[PDB]
Amino acid sequence: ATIGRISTGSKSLDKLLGGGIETQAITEVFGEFGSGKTQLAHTLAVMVQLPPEEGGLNGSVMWIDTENTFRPERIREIAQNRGLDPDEVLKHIAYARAFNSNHQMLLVQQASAMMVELLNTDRPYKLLIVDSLTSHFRSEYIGRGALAERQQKLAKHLADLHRLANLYDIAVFVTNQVTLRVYLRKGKGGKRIARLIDAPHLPEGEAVFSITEKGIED
Ligand SMILES: [Ca+2]
Fold first, then answer.
1. Is 137 labeled as ligand-binding?
2. N or C terminus of the chain: which is more exposed, having fewer CB within 10 Å?
C-alpha cells in the first residue's frame, strides 16, 4: 500500500510533515493542555473524511479517549466551517472511552476486527486517534517499583498500534505530554508552534499555526 497523507488543515504544518500525517506510521504529538494537540486530533478526524484532492483519504475514524477530550460539538463545528455535513462527519467517527490502561490496551487489540470489517468498503478506517497515549499509564504506575511494568506495557501497546497502522494502512495519531514526534508550544498572539524532532527521513523544523472555527489552519 502506498503511504497516504492526511492534511492537518495547516499548509505550514503539512509541509513540515512531508505533506500531512502518514498512514503506516504513529505520529506522537506532545504538549501541555491547550497546546493544540487535541484541536489537531479533532481537525484530522474531519480532514481524513475528505477526498485526496482536498487533503483526506475518504476514510472512517476510530477515537480512543482516555481523558474526556472528545467534543462532538467541535467536530460538528469544524465540519460546517469547511462546508461539510456535520451529522455525516460525526457518524464516521467510532468513539470508545478507555477506562484504564488495561482497557486501553484491549481496545487497540480489539480494533483489528473492526478494521477488517470496513477494509474493502467505501469508507475504510484511515485514522485511529488515541488521546492520550499515556495518561492512564502515568496515573496507574507510580514510582520505582512500577516503572518496569509501565514501560513493558507501553512498549507492547505501541507495538499493537504499529501493527494496526501497517496491516490496515491507517494513520495512528496519539497525544502525549513531556513514532514521529511533534512538540507543540505557545507562540505569540495565541498562535501555536510545532517542532518536528528526530524524524529519520524528514528534517527538523517548525511550523506556526492557528486554532480557528475550521479547527487548525495557518
Ligand atoms: Ca488542544
1. no
2. N
